Amino acid sequence: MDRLDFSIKLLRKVGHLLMIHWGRVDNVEKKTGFKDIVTEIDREAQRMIVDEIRKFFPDENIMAEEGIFEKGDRLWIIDPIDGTINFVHGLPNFSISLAYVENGEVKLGVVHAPALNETLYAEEGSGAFFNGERIRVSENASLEECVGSTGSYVDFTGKFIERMEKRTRRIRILGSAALNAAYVGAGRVDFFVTWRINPWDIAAGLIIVKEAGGMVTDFSGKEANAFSKNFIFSNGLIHDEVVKVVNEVVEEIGGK
Amino acid sequence: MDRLDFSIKLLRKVGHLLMIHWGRVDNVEKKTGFKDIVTEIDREAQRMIVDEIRKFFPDENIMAEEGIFEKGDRLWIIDPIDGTINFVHGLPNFSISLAYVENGEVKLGVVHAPALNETLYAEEGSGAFFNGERIRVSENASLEECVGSTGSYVDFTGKFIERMEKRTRRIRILGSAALNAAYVGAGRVDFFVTWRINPWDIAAGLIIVKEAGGMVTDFSGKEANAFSKNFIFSNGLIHDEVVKVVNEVVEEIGGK
Amino acid sequence: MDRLDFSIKLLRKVGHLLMIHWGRVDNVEKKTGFKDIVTEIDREAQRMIVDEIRKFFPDENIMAEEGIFEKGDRLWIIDPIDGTINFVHGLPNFSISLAYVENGEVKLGVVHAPALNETLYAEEGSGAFFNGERIRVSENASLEECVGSTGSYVDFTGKFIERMEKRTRRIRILGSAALNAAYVGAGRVDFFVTWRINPWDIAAGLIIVKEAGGMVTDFSGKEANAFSKNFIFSNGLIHDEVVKVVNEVVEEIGGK
Amino acid sequence: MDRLDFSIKLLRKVGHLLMIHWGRVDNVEKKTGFKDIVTEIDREAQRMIVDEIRKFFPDENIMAEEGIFEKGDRLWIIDPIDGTINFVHGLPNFSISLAYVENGEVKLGVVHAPALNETLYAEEGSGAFFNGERIRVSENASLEECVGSTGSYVDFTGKFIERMEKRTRRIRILGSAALNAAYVGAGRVDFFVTWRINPWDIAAGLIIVKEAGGMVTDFSGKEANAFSKNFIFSNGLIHDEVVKVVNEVVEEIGGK
Numbered sequence A, B, C, D: 001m002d003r004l005d006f007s008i009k010l011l012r013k014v015g016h017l018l019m020i021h022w023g024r025v026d027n028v029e030k031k032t033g034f035k036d037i038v039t040e041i042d043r044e045a046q047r048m049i050v051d052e053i054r055k056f057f058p059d060e061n062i063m064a065e066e067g068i069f070e071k072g073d074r075l076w077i078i079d080p081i082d083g084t085i086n087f088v089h090g091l092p093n094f095s096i097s098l099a100y101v102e103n104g105e106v107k108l109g110v111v112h113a114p115a116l117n118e119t120l121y122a123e124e125g126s127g128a129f130f131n132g133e134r135i136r137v138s139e140n141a142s143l144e145e146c147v148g149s150t151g152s153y154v155d156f157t158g159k160f161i162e163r164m165e166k167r168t169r170r171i172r173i174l175g176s177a178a179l180n181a182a183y184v185g186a187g188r189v190d191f192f193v194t195w196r197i198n199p200w201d202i203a204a205g206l207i208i209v210k211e212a213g214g215m216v217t218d219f220s221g222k223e224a225n226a227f228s229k230n231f232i233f234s235n236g237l238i239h240d241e242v243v244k245v246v247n248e249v250v251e252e253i254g255g256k
């Protein structure tokens, strides 16, 4: 609609500002370590976005990674650069994410990977799209004919590989949370699992996976929402096959 | 120039055929099981290349992943699709690799990712390029300022992540060996490790990294060649420690 | 729509076939002269399009430029390559046109420019799009504030350009009818004028420009359909001024 | 090489600045009427180009279209946006142009069309390229085998269209002098004529077409250089005829 179209055009415009600096940001800043960085372009991109929303959606709230952490029954969740590390090194797997949550419910989601010219989006009840055409998660039902994905985490990643590497065609670690969730919605991957992520990393990828007929849940298999800590995105075919392996790894390291 | 230009235009032309089928080939074979496939496109793309190769290079040999394994002083190493699994699922990280090896010497290489519109190539003494512009290897001289990569291998993988997660910013698993290697030459990645690999998977990558001022060696740390089993590519500023870690990852599982 | 989504996916896929021979076609045949040519690719592309339509819509008629001139209630109009001259020479302004005419009126229409990655489409009562985002006709209400365009015609073009130049910013001759009409819908040009044209050249553009909010009439101002001979696509704001000048041109050349 | 690479990367970088505002330029200032305008984006982009050149070649001269007119042995000719009108309306045919003129003679030219992803360029003595690929002018030896092109001139155009349309397949009016000239070098067009012009309009085009094996002369047939106001670019196989028509058109209006 108005909101969806606005979001698509906004992220597509800002995407170009990011291209100016892609792989060329000399000022890398650490937030809570060397694996968790931010740059001046993350902020500039966020300002560009936040300002347009604040302009057309005057009395609505914003929750943006870099700083703005408001609350509201009408909240826009923004990730100026999902995959800042990639962005800095020059890898194409980074994106801009914009979800519009109403009453804690994701009503719209859009992910835009600039260097790839891929714009995945979904509005509630309208289905998922990719640059205008319909997308639906894969039909794959056998883990052996599946390609799953994960993000670079503590001891989780390396272990989740060990467990999965056997019953799976191949595992991917691309670099963009939002983009990886959206890829399942587009049928490119079979499932995506995250750990200790904020809502700006998954709010958009959540409605896009479900509107594309997939499944989005926490590690307990109980349907997840924008405010869940663990995330499992899947085509809804080999979901449980994954729910298990994940907890198998979680227990081994420490959990419950 | 002659063979360089030839090679770029050719792979670029072939990339488009791949695009017609990319993500839409549900007729998969297994060259050795699920973890290793081939498609008619693999075959159909390789054909379109080999044909052209002879049309202008009669008295020369050819080596393609699936089908031709000739040998000679004027050889061409072809890989119709590097990342067939990706190509099959709809992932952008797949490429076409081609190297001209004269007297056992890689005289030039070219990697082309059609979905990403990336063409990385290099000629002996001419330096490396990326779509016409020069590319050098990264300057990040410390593991805490690096992003590494490797392919999905038996135990080496999940055990390489664990053994290097706290070492580097991130470890990526993209899918295409030729592309991944070309990326360290591009400085998008600081190092890439490949275990148990064929010549057509690194032939081009090899000369691209070295021409881009990087390092390519076996695990023994000795200068690597088109014919080696395990490779390591880097900016030559963090090779030592990587060799070290690589040489200490096979330990935990085995492989003498 | 599954019909529109069907249309977008089919032309996008076929666009890669075209990309293989774009600028690399050696055998150009004259249909009625050196200014009206055709190639084998036009046919190959068309065949790819027709077989898919006939497979998923077995009882609907087809009217494709190169040969298939059926007629009916459920009709598919096709121009395998709008701008074969451009396509042959290597210019990017060439496209694949597809419209669905029902009981005389165009229900949907998509235009795909492969080299340009531009897919403009519209389904009746749903608005016009450009790669997933909504587009609308321009807002230039003054001719001196406009950019117009036409095709390449015998007498018409020259007189036109003369009788318009001193009254508009500039007139453009890009080379693809469908693409040009669709651009009026995208708002990139303010009006497009075609003379002694064919239905497959304007069916898709007709609905896109109408859905985009503009106007499409014949040279007399009378609204038009896929079957009129002459056309005028505009933003609706400058139309009269255009129809006037056009006839001043039909007047000098001749008519009756 | 030092200068060429620097030029290619700078333009591609500035290219994205342009993409942010492409088709969304609010305030258009008039230079010499609605026929010739400039926008703050032209200035904003020019400043970004000038900025880098001052930094790496501080002791060199600059001649930029929008306000900088220096003179010297080492000189850089610049056009922030060639095809501003196109840029404004949202047409993809616009580009950045940069030439380095050492000792009165241009030895390097770069033309980048951001919206098209086309970087054509040429360093004196090394030949013409297009995104790394090598290019050479066309081989069409007869006008009926060609596709010519012109700029939008108040009297020239219409006449040229008239005395040239029955003689050739089609005459194109694209909207970007630098790109149009680079196109003859790319062989996408057989000839291009420009009436009334400045060094920043065709300095880069000049060298590219020459390194591509074609010819650039003033209307009189006499060779042409960065400093002339009549230009005719061609594949050098139909040049004579074009100069013919060009002159004839001049007689239909006025001159000497």
Ligand SMILES: [Mg+2]
Pocket: A042, A065, A079, A080, A081, A082, A083, A084
């Ligand atoms: Mg972020």
Ligand SMILES: [Mg+2]
Pocket: B065, B079, B080, B081, B082, B083, B084
């Ligand atoms: Mg292969």
Ligand SMILES: [Mg+2]
Pocket: C042, C065, C079, C080, C081, C082, C083, C084
């Ligand atoms: Mg046609």
Ligand SMILES: [Mg+2]
Pocket: D042, D065, D079, D080, D081, D082, D083, D084
């Ligand atoms: Mg300009």
